[PDB]
Amino acid sequence: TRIALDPFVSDLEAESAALRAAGPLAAVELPGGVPVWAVTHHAEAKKLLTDPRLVKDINVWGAWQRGEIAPDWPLIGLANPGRSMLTVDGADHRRMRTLVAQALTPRRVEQMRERITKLTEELLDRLTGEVVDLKADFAYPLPMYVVADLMGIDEARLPRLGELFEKFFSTQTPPAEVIATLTELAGIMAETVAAKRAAPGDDLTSALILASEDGDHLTDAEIVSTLQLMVAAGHETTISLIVNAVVNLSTHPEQRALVLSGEADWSSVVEETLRYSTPTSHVLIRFATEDVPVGDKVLPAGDALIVSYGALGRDEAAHGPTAGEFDITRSTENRHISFGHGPHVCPGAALSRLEAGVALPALYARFPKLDLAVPAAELRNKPVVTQNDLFELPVRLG
Numbered sequence: 348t349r350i351a352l353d354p355f356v357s358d359l360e361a362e363s364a365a366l367r368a369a370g371p372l373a374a375v376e377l378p379g380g381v382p383v384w385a386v387t388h389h390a391e392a393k394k395l396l397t398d399p400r401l402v403k404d405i406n407v408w409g410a411w412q413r414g415e416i417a418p419d420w421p422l423i424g425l426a427n428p429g430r431s432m433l434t435v436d437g438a439d440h441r442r443m444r445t446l447v448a449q450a451l452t453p454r455r456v457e458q459m460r461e462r463i464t465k466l467t468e469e470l471l472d473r474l475t476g477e478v479v480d481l482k483a484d485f486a487y488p489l490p491m492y493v494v495a496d497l498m499g500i501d502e503a504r505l506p507r508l509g510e511l512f513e514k515f516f517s518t519q520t521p522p523a524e525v526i527a528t529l530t531e532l533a534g535i536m537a538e539t540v541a542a543k544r545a546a547p548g549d550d551l552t553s554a555l556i557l558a559s560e561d562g563d564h565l566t567d568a569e570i571v572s573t574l575q576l577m578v579a580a581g582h583e584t585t586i587s588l589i590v591n592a593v594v595n596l597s598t599h600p601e602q603r604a605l606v607l608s609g610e611a612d613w614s615s616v617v618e619e620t621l622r623y624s625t626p627t628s629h630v631l632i633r634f635a636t637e638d639v640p641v642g643d644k645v646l647p648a649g650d651a652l653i654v655s656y657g658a659l660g661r662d663e664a665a666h667g668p669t670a671g672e673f674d675i676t677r678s679t680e681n682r683h684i685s686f687g688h689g690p691h692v693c694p695g696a697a698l699s700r701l702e703a704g705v706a707l708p709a710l711y712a713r714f715p716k717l718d719l720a721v722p723a724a725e726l727r728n729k730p731v732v733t734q735n736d737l738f739e740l741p742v743r744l745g
């Protein structure tokens with residue numbers, strides 16, 4: 348009775364309807380035969396996201412301890428990523444979040460507005476021809492230039508950063524390519540941390556060095572880990588938020604009219620795209636330290652849990668009868684949890700909201716008649732089971 352997630356993501360819409368159907372705790376199978384539970388309703392996901400019995404520590408995974416997981420399993424990098432803020436809980440996690448919150452503040456993000464506006468303008472200036480891949484030519488570079496600038500990375504490095512990002516986020520990248528790419532990126536982060544210790548500035552890296560709580564502060568390895576994790580977590584997710592907003596406005600032309608006329612604000616388009624069409628369909632992975640009641644099922648001790656943000660974004664219990672439709676005018680008594688909830692909540696939420704909030708009005712200001720150059724039906728998801736990412740976004744600029 349276990350929903351196997353399509354690893355080609357041939358039909359996300361149906362799979363998300365199946366996951367919602369299979370009740371708050373759905374038995375699922377991950378690409379490569381690996382069974383896990385998925386929480387697929389909003390209220391139950393919130394309860395589990397704040398339950399300290401659901402931990403990131405892979406030692407708690409019974410299937411893994413019993414060697415029933417192949418060491419070459421394509422998703423192993425997600426299930427078992429090593430030491431970061433991502434994979435700790437309790438006091439160790441709260442220390443990291445406290446120090447990181449001192450550096451990546453709402454103020455620091457808001458102060459990027461003008462730089463993001465200039466980067467957005469420079470990318471729009473390079474758009475030529477009647478039909479473009481808006482993903483490749485606009486959405487894809489923007490978050491790389493922004494995060495490089497936020498982090499204070501030497502602007503001399505940007506031509507190589509584009510090649511390293513491409514290699515790191517590509518399916519096609521080999522094995523000894525993928526690890527040469529990670530090594531070169533960590534070298535750039537280490538060079539940045541050492542440069543900012545020698546010459547502190549107005550950048551996230553400088554702020555991560557300075558952060559402290561009662562004389563406690565991040566180690567170099569913790570700063571480099573944090574910067575790498577933010578690139579990995581923040582790049583393709585922000586791209587897909589911008590892509591999905593353009594796709595949603597293209598396919599709902601009367602709501603496009605409302606925002607372009609100024610009736611509706613762009614923030615309402617961004618928040619509705621996050622709920623209706625989150626870039627992150629599933630997050631791996633949590634493990635129960637004890638049996639955990641979820642509705643009228645039990646999540647057994649040592650079992651795995653993924654959070655199905657994609658499925659639960661359209662939860663009728665949270666958002667009502669229209670949950671299944673894109674409506675930027677909707678009011679919900681329940682804020683979307685597409686950035687997560689509880690201790691592991693996304694620290695980049697303000698930044699990705701600002702990037703999309705600047706990019707989208709800038710794009711429609713340059714090209715207010717822009718539409719899809721191919722029917723909505725021909726857009727295809729990439730073969731990435733956790734993410735809601737398209738191969739391309741063909742648009743007629745007009």
Ligand code: HEM
Nearest residue numbers: 432433577580581584585588630685686687691693695699
């Ligand atoms: C639309 C864009 C993005 C979405 C949809 C997204 C979504 C998420 C979600 C749902 C989580 C929590 C997963 C969970 O615990 O179940 C998360 C964690 C995280 N995100 Fe974001 N995110 C986005 C952009 C970014 C950006 C721009 C950054 C960094 C600047 C970032 C950095 C992180 C980090 C570091 C974590 C791990 C937090 C922790 O485990 O303590 N994300 N993200």
Ligand SMILES: C[C@]12CCC(=O)C=C1CC[C@@H]1[C@@H]2CC[C@]2(C)C(=O)CC[C@@H]12
Nearest residue numbers: 424425428433576579580584627630631
């Ligand atoms: C789980 C995650 C964060 C939440 C989110 O929205 C999307 C993802 C998918 C990619 C993950 C990332 C966290 C950091 C990971 C493990 C890496 O260091 C390489 C792949 C990357």
